[PDB]
Structure formats: C-alpha cells, structure tokens
User: Fold Gamma-aminobutyraldehyde dehydrogenase from Salmonella choleraesuis.
Amino acid sequence: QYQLLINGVLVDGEGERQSVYNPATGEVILEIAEASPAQVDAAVQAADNAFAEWGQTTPKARAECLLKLADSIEQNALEFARLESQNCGKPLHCVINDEIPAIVDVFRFFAGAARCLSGLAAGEYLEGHTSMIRRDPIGVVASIAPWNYPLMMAAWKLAPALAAGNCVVIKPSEITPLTALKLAVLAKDIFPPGVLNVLFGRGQTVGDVLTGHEKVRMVSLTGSIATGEHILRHTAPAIKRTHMELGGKAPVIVFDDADLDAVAQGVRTFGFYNAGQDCTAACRIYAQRGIYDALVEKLGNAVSSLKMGAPEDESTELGPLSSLAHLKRVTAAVEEAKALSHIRVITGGSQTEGKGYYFAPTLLADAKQEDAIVQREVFGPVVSITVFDDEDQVLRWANDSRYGLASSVWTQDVGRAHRLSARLQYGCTWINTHFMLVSEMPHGGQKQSGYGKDMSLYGLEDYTLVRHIMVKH
Amino acid sequence: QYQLLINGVLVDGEGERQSVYNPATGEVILEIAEASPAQVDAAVQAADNAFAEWGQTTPKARAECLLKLADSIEQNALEFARLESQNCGKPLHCVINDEIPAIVDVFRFFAGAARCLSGLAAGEYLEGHTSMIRRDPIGVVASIAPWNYPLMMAAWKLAPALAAGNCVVIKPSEITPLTALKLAVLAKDIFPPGVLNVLFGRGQTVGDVLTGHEKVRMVSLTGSIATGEHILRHTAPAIKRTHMELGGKAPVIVFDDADLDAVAQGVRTFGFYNAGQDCTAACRIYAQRGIYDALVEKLGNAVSSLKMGAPEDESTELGPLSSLAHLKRVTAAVEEAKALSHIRVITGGSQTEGKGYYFAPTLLADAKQEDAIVQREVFGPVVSITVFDDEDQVLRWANDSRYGLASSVWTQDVGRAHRLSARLQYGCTWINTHFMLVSEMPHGGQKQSGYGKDMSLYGLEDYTLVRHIMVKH
Amino acid sequence: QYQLLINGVLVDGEGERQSVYNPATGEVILEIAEASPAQVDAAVQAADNAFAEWGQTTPKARAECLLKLADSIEQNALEFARLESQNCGKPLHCVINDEIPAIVDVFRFFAGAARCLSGLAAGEYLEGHTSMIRRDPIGVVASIAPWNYPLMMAAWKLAPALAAGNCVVIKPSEITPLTALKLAVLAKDIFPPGVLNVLFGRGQTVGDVLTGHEKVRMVSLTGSIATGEHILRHTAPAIKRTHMELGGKAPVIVFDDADLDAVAQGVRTFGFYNAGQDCTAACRIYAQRGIYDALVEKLGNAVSSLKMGAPEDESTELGPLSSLAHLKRVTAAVEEAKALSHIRVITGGSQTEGKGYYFAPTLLADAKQEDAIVQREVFGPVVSITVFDDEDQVLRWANDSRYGLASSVWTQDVGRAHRLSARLQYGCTWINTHFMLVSEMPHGGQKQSGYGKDMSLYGLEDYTLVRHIMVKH
Amino acid sequence: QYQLLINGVLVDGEGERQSVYNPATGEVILEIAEASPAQVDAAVQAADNAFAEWGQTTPKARAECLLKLADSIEQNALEFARLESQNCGKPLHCVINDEIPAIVDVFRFFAGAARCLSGLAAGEYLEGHTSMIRRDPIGVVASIAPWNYPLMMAAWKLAPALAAGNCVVIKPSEITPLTALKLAVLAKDIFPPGVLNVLFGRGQTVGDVLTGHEKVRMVSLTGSIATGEHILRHTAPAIKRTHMELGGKAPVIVFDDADLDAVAQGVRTFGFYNAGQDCTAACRIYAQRGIYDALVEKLGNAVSSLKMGAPEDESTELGPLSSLAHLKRVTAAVEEAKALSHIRVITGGSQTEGKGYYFAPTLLADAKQEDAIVQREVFGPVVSITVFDDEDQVLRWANDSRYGLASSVWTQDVGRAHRLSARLQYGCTWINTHFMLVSEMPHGGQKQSGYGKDMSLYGLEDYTLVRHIMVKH
Assistant:
C-alpha cells in the first residue's frame, strides 16, 4: 500500500480508504488510506519548521537537490511510465517518449533557473541611501495537482516552489495518486525532512483542510473553473496569494491561406492527445469560408482513423477518459450539442461499449459561436468547427471568451500571423502548429483560465517575494 | 458640485447624495451625488470599448499621455494641495512639499517605465520554432483608492495601469473624493474617451457593482483587511486577478548599538506623519533592554512636542484623523491598551476637545508582544514600545505577525543589519531610517498585508500579461 | 561666432579658424575657431572634477535634467531644423518631421530608462554573505559625432552617457558643428558645470588629444572603418573601453513571394534618404530570379522620379552629399562600377552640374557578389541589384560580409521570414520594411560594423559598470 | 605525450617541442609538440564549419552538453587535481577542495544560465510593427588562458562561450597546458566535431596566428597588462570584439572599527593563496592610523607561520611561483621595495634556497601611496601595508589606480560599508571578507584591469549578440 510523506518519514494515512481505478479496465487497482485532518496539520507544521533552515539555503544548494531529484526520476523512468499509464489510461509509449523526459527536463530547467533570478540595479535612488532588491521565498506552499497529467503537473508545482526556497505540501488528485506517492518514496531523502510533503485524499476532506490552514502562505491549483472558484473563496479571508490554472477552450484559427493537411494532422494529434483531457487541446476550430468544406472532410478522415485500444499496446493512439464521473460530463456535453438541429456529427458521437471509460473521437461541424459546445470546455476527445469570414470577426469571437490559455493561427501570411498573435487574448499563441511546450517558455492563462505561470523564469518568480532593502549612509 | 468622468464626458451622479466632511472643522464641505448602478455599468462598457484601440497604442504614445498628465498636475499643484488639505486635514505645507511632487514623480516614472518592460530572449527553444515573449495589457481595470492618501494612491493605481495599456475605472473613497474628481476634469482630454473613468460612491452601492462586473478583468485595492476580505470573496467566482494593499503594523527594531536621537527624531516624524494614518507608520517599536529606558524618555520628549493645529497654518505638524468613524476606532483601540495594568501612557492618551477629529499623539510603553496594541493595526497617531533581549527573539516576534508590509532596523553593526534584513518577513526593510519611498523601488506587502506591488517596474508588470508566441519555420 | 562649452562656461576656441560649408550651395556659411590642445585638456579636467558630485546623483535627478533638455530642444525645434538643413543639405521638411522629434524622443526615452536599470536578485549565493549588483557610471566619456546625422548622433551619445551618470566631452564632426554648438548654448545651465562639454575641431588636432587623454575612461565613436581603426589603435595602450559604430552595407533580400511595389517604394525612400548617407541605407539588393527583371524595372521608375533641389523647398526629396571630399569618394566608387562590363546603369550614374555637391540617384543592376560595388560601402545615393536563386545561397552571401549592422527580408512566407531573420548576421533585420528605428530598440553592428549599441536599455548599459558587492554576515 | 583537439580528433602537434616544468622541483615534467601555423588554421576552419550547425542548437541541447562535461570533470576530479598541482605547484588539497568543485560548478551554472537569457518585451513600439529581441551566438571564439589558474580560467572561457552557442578554439598558457589537454580528451566526444578545439604553444607562434585569424570573431584574454596590450593592438585592424581580464592590485581598506584578527586571518589566506599569483589577491593594505601598529604585528605573526613545502603534502599552505621567469620578476619588484629607506620588512623578503621556484611570504610595512610596491602589481606572495587617516583620503588613494578589479573594506559601521562600496572603482567590493567568488555573481575589471565579465548571466551575455527583429503587419 502506498504511503504518505510527512516530515521526511513515510506513514500510513489515518483517514478513510479510497479506491483508485484503472480507467482502461474500469477495475480497482488499489485502495489507499487518506490523510487524516491531524496528519494534514502535521504536514503543514513540518513544512513551517523546515522553512527556517531551507529558506536560507543557497540557490546552488537547491539546484543540486533538483538535479539529484531529476536523476532519480530518469533512472526510474520506465516504472513511472507504467504507473502513469495504468492509473490514467494514457498510451504507454506516449508516457515513455513524451511525458517522462518532459518531467525530467522541468526539474533540470528549474535547477538552473534557481540561480538566475532577476532584480533591479542596487544603488542610490535617494541621496545617501543604498537600495537593493532581493527575491526571497514565500514560505509554506500548498500544491493541488490535477488528474490529467498527475506526475507532470506535480513537477510543474514542485520544481519552481522548491527552487525558490519554499517548503511544499502537495496533494495529487484522489483519482490519480500513484505517481505522486511513488515520487514521495524517491524524494524522501533528497530534501531535508519537512521540505517536501506528499499527502493523499479528496478535495473535501484533505484539500480543504490544507488550503485553509493558517500557516499556508500560498496555494497553487490546477483544475476546473468549479474547483478553482471553491478554493479562491475559501482562502479569501486569509488573504493568501494564489496561482490558478483553470483549463481553457483553445481556438484554432484557420485561414484560406493555410496548409489544410498540416492542420488536419495537427488537430488529429493535439485535439485528441490524452483523450482531449488537456487545457491546451485544439478543440475549437474556426475555419475560413474558402477552406471550410475541404477542411471538414480532411478532419473527418483524420479523426476517424484514430486507433483506440489497450494503453500498453504500442499501436494505441487514443486512451479512455480519467473516470466514470468525467465520462458522464463529456457524454452530457456532446448530447447537448447533438440536440442542436444545425450541428453535424462528422465522426464519433457517443461513448463506446466496453469495460473502460472510452469515448469515441468526436468531430462536430457547423457549430455556431453562441453554441454551448463552442463556449464551454468539454475536456474530452471532442472537436468543433465553426466557419468565419474576416480577421476582425474571428478575432472578436476568439477574444469574446471566458478562457484565455492557448490558441493557434494557421496561415502563410507573415503580416497576418503577427497582427493576430499580437491581438489574441491568450497566454499562448502558436503559428502553423499547436500544443508545443518548452521548459524555458511560460504557460499560463488569462481571464477565467487563471493567473500565474508554469515553467520559465516567470514560473519561478511567482514563488518568490520581491523585497526592497534600503540602507542609510 | 463635482462630476463623474464617464467615456470622456463629465456627468452628474444619478445615485444618492453623499456628504463630504472637513476633518479639521467637523463641518460638511460639499454634497456629491453618487454613481448609479447604470452609470457604473456605463463606465465599464466605456472602458471595454476603448480597450480595442488603447491596448494597441505604442508605449511611446502612452508615455506621452502620462508626461502630459504629470505636467497638468504640476501646473495645478497649489489647487490640489488646498483640496487634499481641506478634505483630509493634512497640514497644507506637507502636501505642497511632499505629496504633490511625489504624485508628479510617480506619473513621470511610469511614463519612462512604460517603455522599458522586460522579456526573455526570443529564439529557438524548440528546433525549427521561433518563440518570443510579449507583455500585453490585461484589459479593463477597476481601481479602489483609500482615504489616507487620496490623490497619491490614485496615482499609484492609475500610472502603472495606464502605462501598461489598460483602461481604468477608478473609485476614490467616499470619505475623500475631491482630488480624484478634480483630476478627472484635467485628465478628461489627455486620454481617449473611455480609457479613464472616475466614479464616486460608497463601497456597498458603487464599489460592489464595479468589482463584481463581468467585464472587469482586474481589481486593485488599498484599504483595511476587512474591506479586502469582502472584495476577494466577492470576485472569487469570476476568477479575477487582484492586487491587494491591506495595511500593516511596521516594526521598528532598535539595538543598544543604535543612535537613540536619530530613532527618536525618526519615530517623531514617521510614526505620526499624516496622523499615523499610513500603512508604513513606525508604530510598533522593539527596543533592546540596554537602551530601552533611555529611548522611552527621548520618545516622550519628541512626541509631546508635536504641534497640533489648523492645516493651513505653517507651524502645524499633526492633523486630525480622516473621519468621525475612524476617530472612534482609534479611541477604542487606545482605551483597550490603557485598560491593561502594565501599559504606561508616556504622552497623549485620549482624543482632544474641539470641533475636528483630532487625537493626541500617543506613546504607550511597556507593551508586551501578546497585547492587542502590538498585534492589531491602530492606523492612528499611536506608538507602542516593547523591550527585547536577543536578535533571534526579536526576529521571531517581528515575523510572528499577520502583517508584512514594512519594517526598520536601527543598528550600527554591518553584520547585524544585513543578517536581519535578509530574514525579516516584510516587503520592505529600512536600516537606520524609516518611511522613505522612491518611485523606482517596489512597495508591497506579504501575508495579510496583501500581494502585488505599487511603484517600480514590478508595479507596472502587475498590470501586464506575459504571453508566449511561437512561430514554426 | 559659435562658442565652446567648457566647465559650464561658453568660450571662444583658441585654435585655428575652420570654415563650415553649405553643401547645397558649396559656399561657406561661417568660420569657427577650434579648441586648442589646452582647452581640450581643460574640458577633460572639468569633466573629471564634476564626476565626483555628478556620479552620485540619483537616477531621478538625472532623468529631470534630460527631460528639461528635451523640452529645450522641442521649443527650439524650428531653429535646429534650419541649422541642420543648412549645414547638411537635408531637405528641411524631413528634419522638422523626422529628425527633431526623433532627437526629442531619444532624450525622453533615456530620461525614463535611467530609472529602470537591470540587476540580479540580491541574496545569499554563498552561505552567510549577501551579494548585490549595482550599475555605476564609468567616469569621463569622450564622444565623437559623425557628419551624416550631426544632432541625432549627438543625442545618441549624450543621452545614455548622461543618464548613466557620466561626464561627457563631445566633439561633433568639423564638417557639421552648428547644431551641436547650438545645443551647447541651451544645455549650458541644465547640467552642473563640467558635466557636459562641447568642443570643436578636426580629428587630427582636437579628436586625437581628446581620445588619447589619460583621464578619459571611455570613447564612443561613429564614423567610417578608417577613422575607427585610427582611434582603436590610438587608445589601445591605455586599455580604454570603446563603443564603435562603423557603417554598413545593409542587404535587402527580395523573394518571388514579395510585394514588388512595396519594395520599390521602400528602396526609393530608404536607399536614398539623406542622400544615401546612412549606415542602414537599403543599398545592396538581392532579388530572387523569378522577380528580378520585374523589380529592376519598378526600381528604375521609382528612383528616376526622385526630385533633387533646394533643401528649404517642400518638394525636394533628395539633397546633396555632405562635402566636396565625400562627393569625390562616391564618384570614384560609382566610376569603378561603371567600368565593369556586366554592370547596367538603370538610372543616374554621375554627379550633376551645379554649385552644390549633388549626385544623381544611381541604380546599378546585374552586379555580382564579388564586385566592389556590392562589397564596399559607398555611403551615397547608389543602389545595386544582384540576382539569387535559393535561401541558402543568399544567406551565405549576406553573411559573407565584413559589415553586420542592418538588413531586411521581403517575403510573405511566415516560415521563411523567421528562419532567415534568425540566421542573418546583422544587428537588425526588418521584414517587409526597412530603415525603421525606435528609441526602445537597440541599434548596433556586428563584425567590422562595430560593437556596443545606440538606443534602448542596452544603449544605457554600455555606459555603466556592473559591480558585485558582497557583505559577510 | 599529450595531443591537440582539432575537429573532434586528437592529433600530435607539428610545431617545435616545448618543455613543461614542475615549479616545485624545477625539473621538466614532459615535452609537448606545439601546434603548427597550419594546424591553428585547421582548428579555426573546423570551428567555422561547425558553427552553421552548432549555432542553431537549442539552449536545452547545449545545457545537456555542459552538464555532461561537468560530470566528466567531477568523475575525474582527483586526476585533474594531481595534474594541476604537479604543473602549477598549487598545494594538492586546495585544488581538490576549492578549484575542482568550483570548475564543476561553473559548467553547471552556465548549463542552467544558457536557458535563461534576458531580452526586452516583444511588442509594437512602432504602430503596425512587431519588434522582438534575440540573443544569437557571435561565431568562432578564440580563448587564451593564463598560467595562474589553468583549468579554472579554461572553464571561465569555455562555459559561457559554448553555452551561448559559439565554437571555441582555446590555447592554454605554454607554461601550464596539462589540464587543458587532459580536458580535451574527455570533451572530445561531448561536443560535435569542431565545436571545441584545444591547441598548444607560445603566444608568439600559436597565439598570434590564432588571435589574428580572419575567421575569429571574438578574442577573450586573461593575462598581464603587457600581453593584453599586444593582443588589443594586433586585432585592432579587424575590429574584433574583445573580453579583457588584465590583473589588478586589490586594496584592503581597514578601519579602527574592524576586527583585526579576522583581517589578519583573511590576509594570511587571501594575500598568499596560490602564492599570491591571483588578480584578486589581498596584496595592498590601507590600515587606519588607530589600528595600524596593532595590525602590522598581527599580520607579521600570521604571515610568518605559513608553511611552505611539497604540494602533495597535506600540511603545505604555500606553493612556489609558476616559473623561473616569474620568480625573477617578483624578486626584482621586492628588491626595489627593500631599496627604499622607509620600507620595513616585517617577514620574508627574498627567494628561498632550494630546487623549486619558491619565494618566502613577504610583508612590507610603512609603504607610501606613491611607492612602486603599492602602484604596480607584483603578482607574488607579497603584501604591503600603508597607513591612512580619513575615508575621503583612502577613497581617493584606492581610486587613483590604473587597476579596478577587486577590493575589500573591513569595518563594522553599516553606513561606512555601503558609502565606500558605492564609491569604490572596482568591479568587486567585499565587506569584512575578501577573495570569495560565486558562479552567479560577475567578476570583471574596470580601467586597465579590462572589461567584460567572467561568471554570472553577464558572463554569458558577453558571448551573445543582441539583435532586433522587426516585422511589419
């Protein structure tokens, strides 16, 4: 049975047993005991005590811990890949080739970034007084990881927090805790006792006790708009600082000018990768009238060829949805779309028969801007196509969204590419590609998609405190 | 009869009439009509529409507007000084010499800062893809100004917001709206219609309608922990980004090693400036045992010599408190302190007889760490002194606070000065001085004092959105 | 008689009288007395003494001087425009509309930039030691301005130097000293005595005494490769730090994909602006085979329509060359090109008959990569066109150059635009435009075009000294 | 016999055989064949060809090479330590504990720094044009390493150059080539053929051919003012960009206020570390009158106790000088000092009898500001003490120096510490310590000590080219 990491020691949860499912088979993998309210407190106390020493360590010392942690993960790559695949339904080959190396890279990046923090020039801004600017750690940080990319999001939250010199108490999703608890075993001795704490449990029993704790200085979350609203109004009286990543409905803007085959191949991969359970998924397509019909046919052929199957089988391209509950939300969202007279189901449409939580790759055409399928996030293997005419029009539509995380523009015109990317209200804009992320570049939303960034130097800065020290001569 | 600025036009408030008092005489200066819920909506709509054009302006164009605005204020310095003094009770000479030039400087600083935003090096972080980082405006910004420094805090909120390319809807405190409404008349033509909107009203009628509006992307506030908690839980479902400045209880740590006369003179000025109605006020003193008694006597002499009087009279050093309601809170806080048997009233103690809301400069000695007078913010002309022994001890006490805005250390030891300033959990730490602020350096709290900064390049960055654009070759 | 500015006082040069010509009429405007070797020494001594006080001023204080200087220039815009036009032959309307506002903007930009210098985060990089980074002024700076943009280059050298907190001794070109000496009269009282020193004379008598002086810490130059080599080997034993701007042969790469009319209009303006006497002039064109012939015809029509005439006449588009000596160099360079059998003269060709130093706008086609007309800088109203086939080919040719200042690529392909701009070895690369400069962005060469940059924060950083201060706890 | 690294292959030098000495025994260790002029050309050609591919690699790819190189050095720590100690005379324990880990850290630091380069925010600085800033590699870099810290300076030159994406051709000092040639064997396969080239030979035969080569874009040097003047005037016609590190005479300013025992211990270590053969050596002491006599006695006791002996013996604190030629320069410099009637020899004085190039740790007191022993660098185990009275006085003396690399101030006054460190004209100023360097912080001189920095992000920036790309919409 997997254990919890509290103050450098592995312990069994004193809370209620919770069952962890295998989304590909619908069967229960294991049963893990949650953290009790007293253990959540114990974890925060451990972090609070550890901070006095850990917050004074040099960036060099911290970089060395992160590099050591990265090595541990890389050496255990295969094991993490099997767990992540078994617990999430992600095709095994994708985890081994894409995710694990990305995770390893994230730690290495932050190890380096920890020693490169920006400041302002120290000097005499006021006659006879030397001012300087330092970036100190915040203190105790509570991290809540989502279920779509369990280990990767854990990395996105641990790396910058630890690099900045904070103590962390992280809770993975109750749906997907395996990789996080495995990491806890390896990282146990890498950091001083209390610096890293890994808990387990539901957002109602463990999550709320953790985020509401008086000694937690910052709460970084990744989830849906629903679970994000809950935490932001729960931590409001304490005036805690937050870091929000709350999904998105990434628009894919295609002009007549675009390479249709490249768009089709891109949407085939990026709109259905990880069963479309991704905040940056290419799920909302705006196709210009001229190429609309041609693109719809190409997408139809590309999407319908996606092979669904066993995650451990090399040929499998599409896995199942994370849980029974999520399968129901996706089904409902697709049914509302089919109910609309003008919506054409090009391929897929409903959930497939079998043990797992599989849902057929769906392509919905002739969708209109006002439709729910275009406005609300589905977070499943569903893609919609909407026709448009001019730039001004598509730009207004893209920007008239509650979301603002990622987007892509497909066009060959240099002028148009830069003109739109400058005006889109999305934290990220790809041109003639989509879904590509790198450790050096920031990833974060705008509007209801949240605030604060993952990865890059900006990601590290969110876990620091700018401080002004002024000495009088 | 002052008007509101909505979409480049001056209009009369359709809401209820509200009376504005002169704290020095206790008399009503004027009666101003509040903004109606429809006008608050009209103001936000005006800003939202203006953003399409304003967000695309060059930093150069924006810098020119700010420089032009700064000139307007400087040319009307004397008029603003009289209004600010009449409405706040601030000694006139202090407003003319300290505040107005500071306000003018803030605009000039941001005018320059607008053209110096940081980014990451553009390049190929991923083979065959050029990534670049841009800092774009957030959109519509709602600013709520406090009553202690009406025009200055207005500047602290308008300058960075406008420099970053946002559209602002600002509401000054109902207690002190004169300077803001005066600024509205001058800035009317400097910015395009809708870019700058100035409203008026109570936090319950106007403030809540403004901060809760769906089109407001960001809310920047400066006030108490009470009004801050209210707004943060009100905007929580919309997942809006905030900028909080929520007061503080600035500690003044004095070692045996310190220059006692310099401390006394400093506390005389900085602990009672603006009637102690300042977040950075030197109000909580920790004096080391060796020099404790000597410092208490020096402070007694320094504080009791503060001349209270008419704001327009050149000799006046201390003005009244902002309002009748605040006079009552300060009186209550001081009475609770006097009730404690161990507290010694060195000077002052209670409110002075007369028309205005004057309160005598109070010095409370022998206060203990656990006392309410040391833990809770008084935000009045009240200073407490607590004895201490070692650094470790005073450091724990200073850090065991809900507040984290400013602090000062008075000592001659180079080692000690740097050792403590590195470990204090305050956004700002002065050494052998206190209260000194400069436009280039950041000012912002930690913990319950808030997050986000006023002034400096960091102040401007809080009003921008980091965006990652990636072009595939 | 124009005077020199030494130690806050205006004085007559003790050196030999030098005549200043009007390039449009070939007549002498005035006669100015050069600075004597003793006065050059006096100027450097004045700067050296003034540095003790000036180097300690706050960035705010310096920003205020620059803003005040900018106002003075803007208020005297028309007068400077007439002098610059009379002394350089530049069409008056271009000076009033383009140059003066640019100059004013440069000062304003640096006034703001002075308060935004970058540093690294202060902190404990070594246990028990606080490290911080400050940017201090270099000391006494000697600036040598060129003759093509007398007042603008003066601004490019004075603004960052003064903003950084240095004391400057500037010498404009003996050919064009009017605007600089006029500026000296206005700036006289803006800066403390000795902070700004304006001298006059030939590079042999005044320039060498100034650049070789023991108290000059840095020398910033803008001129030809010849005058640059002379100064770099003259200051070599003193190990002085330099800032070089040594011309360039900006390539204009045009693909089949490009908008030919936009290229023609661009080359018409940017290849002949200021009589082609500009380091960034679009003088070397590489046209892809597909559009070669069509572009040559369009350029022929565009270039031949350029109206040459009196600088004060509104319709004049092309002025004369700076001096008789330069007219001879340009004539010689063009004659060597005509001598080559394969070179086709599309338009212009030789110097025009008349009093001024006018040279007809020349377009030379069928030029080959190895030709002298393509390799060496002409710095006149001459443009060459070379045919090319692939990207790899044109990229090798563009990079196989001693120069590396500016360049432009004309194409509609997003991929190509970014792929080439990433690989070009030029300090600047424009896409579908050319010659556009802004105060916020850096301008500086690579290879023999020099090192160090003009404008932007990078321009200011070149006049500062990064210093590491480390305090042991 | 050690080989050269040219285009990924190890080859024997075709030049004349040169003997490498063991400074501790005065005996010849080995005889190595120099690189022939044709091989130096072959090395540069190899680098030039390799640049096309290497300059396009991602910062991630480069970081991975540096991390891999760092591992190789760390795994071979002991071997490098023995070679460095045998070839330089450095006590073995110092190399194992101080140098090797520092070298390893430098590579790791730059591996991280390579992915964190600064730029300016991309955006529209000019209406309808997107500007962005990229930092591209310079091209082929020629590095000349000094003899004092052979492997460390090699690291200081290779790490940033390679991290920035340049191709390097490095030549260690002919006196100390062992560690560099050993590194060549290990790094052979880590980088693509031609990216890293290691040559060997005298500055006259190999050095001049390398630095004068037409394809070398940048030359980074570390040596004396003599060898620096030679290279700067040799590369002057090519207008190559340089990076100079030319020694220094680090002042140690001690006030009455200082901890004399801490100063004595500091000077004992830092003034004689590596036999005083260091640019940052605490060799020039200014002691305030009050503590002058007391400090001279303490230094006398501290210096005379330094144990000289075999480098491989654990107890050895002081090693010999690098070569017979340098032993002669040091002896001459000390003899000129002894000749002065006012100079008191407290300890040491002359060279010790024995096989090696040992020189006794010398302390010269009562030295005056004008004396040659205080003005010129000795670069040996020699320390001078000068008395002073006021700050203004000592500040003028410290700044009236041709050197400007490092310095230290010993005082307990916070005001004084910051007031002096702000005004010292040295690239580095330590307070109550000396000689401490960290990878994150810059190390570089001012005035005749050179320009450009080693270590930190600034160190990496010197090997990049800021480029402005502007796309028109």
About this structure: DSSP finds 15 helices and 21 strands in chain B. The radius of gyration of chain B is 23 Å. The longest helix of chain B spans residues 92-113. The first strand of chain B starts at residue 4 and ends at 6.
